[PDB]
Amino acid sequence: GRIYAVGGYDGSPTHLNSVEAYDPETDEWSFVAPMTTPRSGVGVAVLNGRIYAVGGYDTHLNSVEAYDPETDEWSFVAPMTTPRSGVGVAVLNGRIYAVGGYDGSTHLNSVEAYDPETDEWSFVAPMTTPRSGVGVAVLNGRIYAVGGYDGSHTHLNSVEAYDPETDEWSFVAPMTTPRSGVGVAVLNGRIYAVGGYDTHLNSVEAYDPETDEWSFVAPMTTPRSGVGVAVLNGRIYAVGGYDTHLNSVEAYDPETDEWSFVAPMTTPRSGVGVAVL
């Protein structure tokens, strides 16, 4: 029942290990325990009652830290094989998938899956297009890799969908606007691609997998690339990003098609990871 904003970069007048938690019922952000390693461009996902902070840039990181909210403690888990900043992370069928990113130790099309029951990462099928700054979300039994930057030199509007049952990636319909550093979340049977960089974007596009179509929805007030996006209590929250490095937070209600500001974080954060637990 909280949104966690994990790491990022405070470029206001620092790569962050700090973590803030938002309670929608009180409209308040509070600091929790910080991660060991500072991470900007970090991917964050939730599995089996832990937040996982995957990769990022401190050195480009293959390390992964897990947070237990019941104890307010972080601990390292097994590292990925490939270092990845600008990585997208999502959870499907009991695995965390780390998708793409940049290995500054290559823009990556490789994908690694983590099983918490074995504490092991393995490679699965790679995407067709390398993607750093990619948004990843899960809907109807597929992982969608949305946008990003292929520097193997294009900002991408293309979108690939992964089926774990076949271990295959397939292209779906592309977004209208190319978006790197895009935030992606899922609500009411649609994938929302929020902000990013084409021009720093306040526009938002929604994908219906049943029709294979993207449509624009209401734009955010503030343009945000490097934005973190998560879903809680029937709203999409767009957290931080770079317009100014932002500590502001906007909430989208799909039933009204409106964005509004909520309480800002204490620390401005671009390249921030955001998950709900």
Ligand SMILES: [Ca+2]
């Ligand atoms: Ca509550």
Ligand SMILES: [Ca+2]
């Ligand atoms: Ca527990």
Ligand SMILES: [Ca+2]
């Ligand atoms: Ca299992």
Ligand SMILES: [Ca+2]
């Ligand atoms: Ca299936």
